[PDB]
């Protein structure tokens, strides 16, 4: 931030470092946009609307209409189900001034909320509140929506109502037009009070979904049958919301069972339905299209480049799928596809990230693996070093869900099942063998706390036998934080205060460590994706934009060999005095490399599950009772426990006070 | 088949060269199959049906029939929308077994015409005759499927009428059953003769087809509405077509069209309709499912793998979009869903050839380049230079279709458009300027021989202006050959001896390069894909199977790097011993200077396009001006004159006769 001196340390840095394997050439996604009179003011409708109607006064308008709304989704949920949320707002925000002005018909954009808010701390470093304003103010005629998980607003663990009222509160402030609320499971009772604030602002309108899963046109299901749907909807109704929606999270709506679905709350209930849907099994378009032919009101598609597999259904069909009928959404077919080369290059920048699907897959009807969590998963795995054993991961993830009676596997309580299924893969016991004796198992923390009822009831009851032996004997305890004397009173006022502190109460090592990081080199969210996350080239110039009326050059021009132990240096260029940095090498500097062996086979040796840092705690001799604890392994958001199989003694161990350690090759030895 | 020492001669030289380069580590896409009892006899399938109800009861069946039908495009169109068309028999022949006992209820399978009669003959060098007859021992109980093109048959330009007869005679005495028969331009005429003989045969039901394009439900304009599409079905179903088909190669058919249009067929004409579509623009299920809401009869699908893009819509989807409601299938999604692993392992083997497109797009209403050919067609534009500008073409595409009377384009009249516009992105002129003055632009032989009459008429009728400017002045010489005395002989007779003449008219060149291999190393369609295609590697074991009875087993030890002499050594062990051999070095010895000179700054330099043998005829002097023909530059199936620039003086010709000249390069220099 501060001229060059700062900056040039960070791109120093990735430079050397550079975790990727080479780069096939530069790409400038800017160079393919459409031309048009940026400098005209935008066209008007779909906000103005709100602000000089009601809130009430618009669900009305919408119901009563020949015309289908669009959603788009590119911006938040697009994304995150190919590229493993990391898109950053330089990008998907210079095409904003475009959609806007050449797509006023457009009902709202969904850009807000989600797991962006974790992802933008911990990795792309970057402040979340700013990029709202930006997206506001680069779309001012347009309403945006937000996700939002009742009282979990934006993480895996309830938070207190005040944390709430005042994080709804700002985001109003801020600017948001459209609140959608869904709950892990489907209890009412753990949202009301998200709706009972959102609705005592005035102002914006609430939206309460629905989540869907199973098939209720099959005969054998009998428990998520229509009856279920109808009693929540009744309730959702009841409990004051403006508008219903429909959230399917992994795409298994079909063409039948929407229609009979909509028909049914269409004919008993006057509110607009919302709908939404993934597009992993094929074509998910026929869904929208037998919805939209009994009811519904509006739709959500991503971008043509950015549609299919995981993510959801291409928007360019849904507008041609519609026309010259009495569904003409009114958008401009040549309008809507005079965009696509822009999102088709941002794709190809965001190479190595890509972990997505590649295809149609027919299996997703056995394992139900959300939308927007195979990226992420898969990322996971690869970190812990599993990555190569995914077809076990995704038997372990079906067994595991079908263990626990069924449960509605959504965004807060995906986790569970995939940090169960990871720990199965891991130690080499299968999900069958672990409802028989879940008493010698080291169960992750987050999956035994979903045991403690501390995520409401699942709707289908507890496993009667399974419960009861899993929490026996795990000193079942923990306090909990309390805002003291100044949050209280910080989270009442309005501006870049109480901002801060939710941040700190939501994520305290994130916020820390990008307050260090920004404190160290500057604000890095003017920067391209490459120049953030692959570095510098040699020879070809940069542009690196800091604020209006400041830009700078820098250039590469030579590195220097990698030194015995002192240090490597790199030079660069700001249009003179070849200024000279100082970066040390974390990865070509190698230690002894001799890993403790690795045995398998003997009854009698105790491994690793997955690579993470161990802690060992264990004295020679002092016999060891089967399925004692022995040490603590603790990775990227995971903490499990590590038990002996067999009594015995300690004899030998041999590890260091706390180190990494392999996937698995020693910590103690039993006779 | 051979002794050894033949096919260890191929196995040696394919090792060397192998223009692939890295490969990952060796996997055996046999390993993943399911598992079931192969000694009992499939169960009765459709093919009992039609032997029993003959061709005709057959239809009538299929009419009154409440389940929607399914074909399985997987062995015919599928790879050769994705994977060009390189699929050896080996690889599909060990899933038929498992296909035939496991989904009986398919309607048939289409794996056979179209495009792979040329390919199975010059790059997998291997018989047609041999493979369906493979293909049809496997599946005994399902009927096989064809792509024929009436006139054209499995070539390109037509073919005299004893020839036609006298290939489907022998095709459906080789087990072929259900024939397409369609043609480019909608006109019975061109078909006619086909039908004939197609009903003559006694069992084999003909399908007729015709093409659509443009749109039907819009008003705007009123060329390709639905007055023509019903004059269009009135005469195939008095030229007395067995069953009506719809097959739309683009993939433009929406839902409100599809259901006006299917609705008017059904209530005057009592045949069934059978649909097909590619899946380019979005999710296509939309039109089946609005189809088979109206009458519609049968469709077609495709594995889960490869599916999606370019290919037809997943199976998966279509069984279960039709599930538990009044069009039930039949099949079980539970035992679909078991050979997607072989599937996707297969589609790793192939990975070098990888055509098509990442994600869906919008934008094929604008350029419609059909399904199944924007694979085979990027193919082709690599090898001659133009692999990068892939997007500069669509427009040269829309263009050639716009200027010449917007017509119907499948693969006959497919491969001139995408002639043309390859040769309009060479020079650098445009589509308007070749408009403009026909008569100064050269033009490909393929365009050449449309433009004069040898294809047919388009039902909008020959442009006027350019028409009459193309043609005159320029040339018209295309003799016809004459069937030898004793060759028409031959085709009276049944058995081999007809099926290698027939292979020889077809094509002749690839059946002498054919029968040269055959000689030179024997029979080779019994290896795998890994060593036909890539090689051998260092030291592990090579299960080869030569023929009946033989299991040679080999394994590479050693390649010896040539020193001094240019040849090279290759030591392959064959059961326990070891034997040297020696293979050339193509591709090390290569070492010649290209002085390319294309440059356009200063006009009079004549600059072959692209890559290819370009013959010159102008000599020294001989000044002459422009529109005539100076050098036939040849290429991958495309003789394309090159064009002549203004007048002036021609002095050096930095060519001899023939030599060799890759794109972008000088070939005559005028001034
Ligand atoms: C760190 O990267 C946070 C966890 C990743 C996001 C998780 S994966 C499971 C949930 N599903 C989803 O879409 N996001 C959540
Ligand atoms: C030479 O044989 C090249 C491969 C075959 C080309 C095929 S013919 C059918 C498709 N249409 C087209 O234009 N090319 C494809
Ligand atoms: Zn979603
Ligand atoms: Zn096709």
Redesign the pocket.
């Given at each position: 931030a501060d001229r060059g001196t700062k900056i040039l340390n960070f791109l120093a840095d990735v430079t050397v470092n550079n975790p990727y394997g080479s780069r096939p050439s530069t790409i400038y996604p800017d160079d393919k946009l459409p031309d048009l009179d940026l400098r005209a003011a935008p066209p008007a409708g779909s906000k103005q609307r709100l602000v000089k109607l009601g809130p009430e006064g618009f669900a009305r308008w919408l119901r009563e209409s020949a015309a289908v709304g669009v959603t788009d989704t590119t911006f938040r949920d697009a994304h995150?189900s190919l590229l493993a949320?990391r898109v950053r707002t330089s990008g998907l925000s210079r095409v904003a001034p475009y959609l806007a002005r050449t797509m006023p018909q457009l009902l709202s954009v969904e850009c807000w909320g989600?797991?962006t808010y974790?992802?933008a701390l911990?990795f792309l470093k970057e402040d979340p509140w700013e990029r709202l304003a930006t997206l506001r103010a680069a779309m001012p005629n347009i309403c945006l929506q937000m996700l939002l998980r009742g009282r979990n607003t934006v993480g895996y663990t309830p938070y207190p109502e005040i944390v709430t009222s005042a994080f709804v509160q700002e985001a109003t402030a801020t600017g948001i037009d459209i609140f959608r609320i869904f709950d892990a499971l489907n209890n009412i009772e753990s949202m009301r009070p998200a709706i009972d604030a959102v609705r005592e602002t005035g102002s914006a309108i609430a939206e309460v979904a629905m989540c869907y899963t199973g098939d209720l046109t099959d005969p054998g299901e009998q428990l998520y049958t229509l009856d279920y749907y109808l009693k929540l909807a009744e309730q959702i109704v009841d409990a004051g919301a403006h508008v219903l929606a429909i959230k399917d999270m992994a795409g298994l709506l079909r063409p039948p069972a929407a229609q009979r679905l909509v028909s049914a709350l269409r004919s008993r209930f006057d509110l607009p339905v919302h709908l939404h849907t993934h597009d992993t099994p094929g074509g998910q378009l026929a869904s929208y299209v037998a919805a939209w032919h009994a009811g519904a009101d509006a739709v959500d598609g991503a971008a043509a480049p950015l549609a299919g597999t995981t993510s959801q259904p291409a928007l360019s069909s849904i507008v041609a799928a519609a026309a010259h009928t009495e569904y003409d959404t009114g958008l401009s077919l040549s309008a809507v596809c005079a965009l696509e080369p822009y999102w088709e290059a941002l794709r190809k920048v965001y190479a190595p990230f890509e972990s997505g699907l590649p295809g149609p897959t027919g299996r997703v009807y056995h394992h139900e693996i959300?939308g927007?969590?195979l990226s992420?998963?898969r990322?996971?795995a690869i970190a812990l070093g599993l990555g190569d054993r995914f077809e076990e991961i995704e038997e372990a993830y079906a067994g595991a869900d079908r263990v626990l009676g069924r449960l509605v596997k959504v965004?807060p309580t995906?986790?569970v099942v995939?940090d169960l299924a990871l720990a199965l893969v891991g130690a080499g016991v299968s999900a069958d063998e672990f409802a028989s004796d879940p008493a010698r198992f080291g169960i992750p923390e987050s999956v035994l706390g979903f045991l403690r009822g501390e995520l409401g009831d699942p709707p289908g009851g507890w496993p009667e036998p399974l419960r009861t032996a899993a929490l026996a004997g795990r000193g079942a305890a923990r306090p909990t934080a309390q805002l003291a004397a100044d949050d209280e009173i910080a989270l009442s006022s309005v501006g870049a205060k109480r901002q801060a502190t939710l941040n700190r109460l939501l994520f305290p090592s994130p916020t820390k460590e990008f307050n260090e990081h920004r404190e160290a080199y500057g604000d890095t969210s003017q920067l391209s994706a490459n120049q953030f996350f692959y570095g510098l080239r040699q020879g070809e110039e940069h542009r690196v934009k800091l604020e209006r009326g400041v830009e700078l050059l820098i250039g590469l021009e030579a590195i220097s060999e990698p030194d015995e132990r002192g240090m490597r240096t790199v030079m660069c260029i700001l249009n003179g005095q070849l200024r000279p940095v100082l970066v040390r090498d974390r990865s070509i500097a190698s230690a002894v490399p001799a890993a403790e062996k690795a045995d398998r086979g003997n009854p009698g040796h105790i491994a690793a599950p997955f690579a993470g840092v161990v802690t060992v705690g264990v004295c020679v001799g002092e016999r060891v009772g089967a399925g004692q604890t022995i040490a603590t392994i603790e990775a990227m958001?995971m903490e499990a426990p590590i038990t002996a199989p067999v009594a015995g003694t300690v004899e030998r161990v041999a590890v260091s006070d706390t180190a990494q350690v392999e996937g698995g090759d020693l910590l103690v030895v039993v006779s």
């Open positions: 995150q949320t989600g797991a974790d992802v911990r959300p927007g969590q992420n998963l990322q996971q965004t995906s986790k995939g958001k």
